[PDB]
Amino acid sequence: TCPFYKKIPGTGFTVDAFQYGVVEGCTAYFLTHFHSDHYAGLSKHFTFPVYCSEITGNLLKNKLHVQEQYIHPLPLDTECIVNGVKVVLLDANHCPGAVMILFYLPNGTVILHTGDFRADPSMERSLLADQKVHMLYLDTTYCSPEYTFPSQQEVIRFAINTAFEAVTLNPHALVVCGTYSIGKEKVFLAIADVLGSKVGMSQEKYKTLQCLNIPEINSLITTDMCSSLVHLLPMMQINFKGLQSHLKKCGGKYNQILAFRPTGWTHSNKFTRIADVIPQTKGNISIYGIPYSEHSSYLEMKRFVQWLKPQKIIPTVNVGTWKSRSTMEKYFREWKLEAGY
Ligand code: NI
Numbered sequence: 001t002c003p004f005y006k007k008i009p010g011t012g013f014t015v016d017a018f019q020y021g022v023v024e025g026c027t028a029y030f031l032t033h034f035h036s037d038h039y040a041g042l043s044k045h046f047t048f049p050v051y052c053s054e055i056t057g058n059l060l061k062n063k064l065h066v067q068e069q070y071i072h073p074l075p076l077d078t079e080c081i082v083n084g085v086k087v088v089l090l091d092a093n094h095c096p097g098a099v100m101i102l103f104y105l106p107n108g109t110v111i112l113h114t115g116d117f118r119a120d121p122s123m124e125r126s127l128l129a130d131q132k133v134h135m136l137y138l139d140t141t142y143c144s145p146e147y148t149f150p151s152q153q154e155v156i157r158f159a160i161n162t163a164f165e166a167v168t169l170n171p172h173a174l175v176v177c178g179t180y181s182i183g184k185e186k187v188f189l190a191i192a193d194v195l196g197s198k199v200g201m202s203q204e205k206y207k208t209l210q211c212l213n214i215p216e217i218n219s220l221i222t223t224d225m226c227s228s229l230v231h232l233l234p235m236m237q238i239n240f241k242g243l244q245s246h247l248k249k250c251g252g253k254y255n256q257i258l259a260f261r262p263t264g265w266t267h268s269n270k271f272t273r274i275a276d277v278i279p280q281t282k283g284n285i286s287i288y289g290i291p292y293s294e295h296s297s298y299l300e301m302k303r304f305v306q307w308l309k310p311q312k313i314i315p316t317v318n319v320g321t322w323k324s325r326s327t328m329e330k331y332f333r334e335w336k337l338e339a340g341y
Contacts, residue, residue: 005137005316008113010105011085015113015137018042027083032115033098034059035181042066051082053089055097058211059182077127090126092117094294095183096212102127112308113137114316119296119304128308136310140317141295143328147265148298149291150274156190158274159260159290163191166258167229174250175230176259178238182208183294184262189220191260192230200228226253235261240282247285256284262292305332306339 006017012027018041023029031039031052042050044065049072052060057073060066074080076089076099086104094116103111110133117139163175175195177188192199199221201209206223214220222228233246238261247257258279266289268277279286296304305313313332318324 003319005314005319008103008111010107010109011103012083013085013103015101016115018046022048030101030113031056031060032092032101032113033095034063035095035116035183038116039064046070051087053097053099055212056099058213059097059208062211063208088127090123090128093120093123094118095181096185096214097182109134111135111137112310114139116141116294117296118294119300121303123304124307133308134311135314136305136308136312137314137316138301138305139295140301140315140319140328142265142293142298143301143315143318143331145298146267146270148269149265149293152186152292154274155262155290155292156186158277159187159288160190160194162288163230163258163260164194167195170256172254173229173256173258174247174254176238176243176246176257177230177232178235178259178261179205179232180235182212184292185209185214187260187262187290187292188230188232192220192228195229197229198222198224198227199230199232200225201232205232225250229254238287240285240287243285243287244283257286259285259287261287261289263289264293264295265291302331302335306335309339309341 002017002020002023006014008015012025013030014023014026015030016032016038017023018029018039028049028051031050034056042060042064044067046066047070050070051072051074054073057071060071061068074089076091080087088102089099090102092098092100092115098115100115100117101113110131112133167173175191188199201221203223206221209217209221225231238259243257243259247254269291279288315328318328
């Protein structure tokens with residue numbers, strides 16, 4: 001059955017609730033983004049209205065075969081009316097197509113559902129600046145002070161410099177980047193751009209990326225693995241055995257692999273700066289775990305909330321244990337006391 005934190009009171013709406021069958025009294029199903037924990041349940045047999053971004057809708061039509069008549073894409077940063085309720089979609093700074101949803105209830109309550117997000121001060125100048133929020137349904141993925149991470153920009157600087165140096169020293173090295181869902185495309189696109197190469201990938205992954213409106217994508221991606229020195233592989237193949245095997249498949253075009261695993265967080269962050277990151281190496285294969293996150297750090301999250309000053313916070317992540325829930329609730333109290341709301 002559907003959890004309460006996926007239900008929008010005073011409406012017929014749900015958010016990211018497609019794995020529960022027909023939800024009682026739900027007249028419209030919102031999808032914040034195309035990640036499997038959120039879309040789980042959608043298919044060509046779904047016949048209720050789905051509201052989402054343009055990019056998410058492209059992905060529903062092409063990858064899951066949802067019929068066009070049931071997909072209702074909305075433009076961003078635009079007041080729209082859904083079953084008599086005003087809504088606005090905002091950029092969530094997550095993966096492509098990912099949104100936050102603002103709901104303006106008939107009785108005057110205003111609700112912000114962040115979906116998955118990486119808070120940023122640029123959000124303090126959208127349609128959020130323009131009114132009060134009574135309830136915040138918050139992506140609390142990294143809601144603990146140990147989660148610190150660098151900027152996406154610092155992480156991409158590290159990756160480009162590392163790959164550029166490696167291929168300059170050995171023009172026969174291959175660079176590999178792991179992926180398992182949309183998101184984190186800057187990793188592999190920025191490396192390919194500095195090396196003067198396209199990113200080679202499976203036909204299935206190329207079709208996924210063509211669904212995204214990313215300008216100049218014919219320009220950075222390809223299915224011709226032969227002509228490329230940056231290859232994209234499933235995240236599960238980013239280990240010494242998987243990569244030895246891949247190297248064998250390239251027919252002696254290459255003699256070394258430098259691979260990257262963009263992860264959310266790793267406890268190395270508590271003791272190490274980005275400049276100090278080192279790989280795991282075996283033979284002619286090196287693997288770098290880099291802290292490229294598409295979720296808020298603890299400090300980012302805290303800043304957002306102390307700026308927005310919601311009347312009530314409803315966590316959407318880590319809610320399944322009493323200890324985590326209690327931990328989060330204690331931080332929310334601190335933030336409120338410190339900010340004076
Ligand atoms: Ni996500």
